[PDB]
Amino acid sequence: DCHLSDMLQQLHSVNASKPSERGLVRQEEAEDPACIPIFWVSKWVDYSDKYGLGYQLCDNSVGVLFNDSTRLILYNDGDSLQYIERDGTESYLTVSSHPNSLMKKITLLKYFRNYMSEHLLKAGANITPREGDELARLPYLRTWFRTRSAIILHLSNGSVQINFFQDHTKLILCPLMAAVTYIDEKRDFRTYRLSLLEEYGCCKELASRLRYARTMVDKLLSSRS
Amino acid sequence: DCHLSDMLQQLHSVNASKPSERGLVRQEEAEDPACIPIFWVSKWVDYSDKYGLGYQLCDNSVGVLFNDSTRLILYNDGDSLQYIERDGTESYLTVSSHPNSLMKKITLLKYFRNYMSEHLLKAGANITPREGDELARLPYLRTWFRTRSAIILHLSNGSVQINFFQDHTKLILCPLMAAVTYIDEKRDFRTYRLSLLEEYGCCKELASRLRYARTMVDKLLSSRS
Amino acid sequence: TYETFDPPLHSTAIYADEEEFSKHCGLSLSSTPPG
Numbered sequence A, B: 001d002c003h004l005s006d007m008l009q010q011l012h013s014v015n016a017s018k019p020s021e022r023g024l025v026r027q028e029e030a031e032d033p034a035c036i037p038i039f040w041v042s043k044w045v046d047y048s049d050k051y052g053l054g055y056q057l058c059d060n061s062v063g064v065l066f067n068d069s070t071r072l073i074l075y076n077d078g079d080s081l082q083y084i085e086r087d088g089t090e091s092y093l094t095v096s097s098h099p100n101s102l103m104k105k106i107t108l109l110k111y112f113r114n115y116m117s118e119h120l121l122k123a124g125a126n127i128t129p130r131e132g133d134e135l136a137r138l139p140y141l142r143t144w145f146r147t148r149s150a151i152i153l154h155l156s157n158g159s160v161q162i163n164f165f166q167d168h169t170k171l172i173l174c175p176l177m178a179a180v181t182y183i184d185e186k187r188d189f190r191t192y193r194l195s196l197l198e199e200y201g202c203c204k205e206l207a208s209r210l211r212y213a214r215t216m217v218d219k220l221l222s223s224r225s
Numbered sequence C: 001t002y003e004t005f006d007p008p009l010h011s012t013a014i015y016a017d018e019e020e021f022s023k024h025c026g027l028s029l030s031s032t033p034p035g
Helices: A002-016 A100-119 A194-200 A204-222 B002-016 B100-119 B194-200 B204-224 C018-027
Strands: A041-047 A052-057 A062-066 A071-074 A080-084 A090-094 A141-146 A150-155 A160-164 A170-174 A179-183 A189-193 B041-047 B052-057 B062-066 B071-074 B080-084 B090-094 B141-146 B150-155 B160-164 B170-174 B179-183 B189-193
Touching: A002 A194, A002 A204, A041 A100, A041 A150, A041 A160, A052 A100, A052 A141, A062 A100, A062 A141, A071 A100, A080 A100, A150 A204, A160 A204, A170 A204, A179 A194, A179 A204, A189 A194, B002 B194, B002 B204, B041 B100, B041 B150, B041 C018, B052 B100, B052 B141, B062 B100, B062 B141, B071 B100, B080 B100, B100 C018, B141 B204, B150 B204, B160 B204, B170 B204, B179 B194, B179 B204, B189 B194
Parallel strands: none
Antiparallel strands: A041 A052, A052 A062, A062 A071, A071 A080, A080 A090, A141 A150, A150 A160, A160 A170, A170 A179, A179 A189, B041 B052, B052 B062, B062 B071, B071 B080, B080 B090, B141 B150, B150 B160, B160 B170, B170 B179, B179 B189
16 A cells, blocks of 8 residues: 555654654644644444444544445435445445345444444544545545554545544544644644654654554554555 | 431420520530541532532542432542442442443543542541541432522431532531531531530521521421431 | 444443533532632
């Protein structure tokens, strides 16, 4: 994957500079609100023991990565659907057309959707993405895995999101912008240019989470073998 | 129960003596520092519109009387827990080895304890309670209500505490000793034998609140039976 | 949703929003604060 390879190079460069060991750390000078992601996972449900992993994006679209390696997406209009087969082939349809071969997967997706809207908090609700729907091709969850400390979510657009269980902090890494958005315990949102974090440094909390991110990107790259 | 009955008889007896309508009052002679209580409510927050009422006891333990008549007590060790169901069933768990059944109620307590610890003052800070922990079973909030002028707190050890909102005076009534402790506006604390207040008298401030206390205790019984 | 639909693991629940909790506590009645 060319996107993962870029993200690895970006993270290694900033981490190798030891951003938190500067005499004067100026994390604020690396902020660039113009690089705020357009998409991130706002909710997720790990039912992988039975059905798979369902999730919501920040535009209120929902998707499910079923255990058979297929993916079903429900756009925020509540009817349009995108079906991704094992080999990546994409097809477009609706809940209204009533495609019989997908009825069961549609029903499961709606259970995921209803469970998320009824029980789960929407991450990033206090912030607005970069651009609108027209400029925004809806991504899908390509792969994911859970660790002791976080869940790792790799979207098809190259973004890698990491949600930490302990303190609810989250990272959204975009290799196209060479940027990282950090959500702290208070739910404050900040987007930084990785090149500027290298130049001006950053606090230890972000620095350590960026070291964690690099370990997870290596893991994502090794699993692609 | 019988503790409320004993208290009502004690309050009726002292009020019937009109302790503030005396030619001479010697309130200090009615003091008995042997009856200083072991437990009282130091903090509380009424979230009953959604979850219930949380509170802190003087030993820094925490409790919550949820809207479903269940209770959860966090001892001063910071880990041990006691869960009193609606049917009196008591269960002694810990935040570490806690069932997924109580995950929500455990989290909500922690929020109560967090808000109380950082935002609210500890009533009875200058106090040194009686005894200690040995044979000192931690009490729990059996019931509570609030009027326009005060909040009435009934503990499981029979004690009844009344905090007056506007002037911050507080009564701690112990039926086992026929004693009352009064916390005045200056946060001073004095423990009296109700029977001695009959014999020596008291200021109208304490007498008027003991009249109010009796009507509150009559209310606690009108609900019990 | 569906009754038997019982996910074992999921993201942060709505009740686990301490910013909203600590807030409503400030708007509701409580014991005396420092002053």
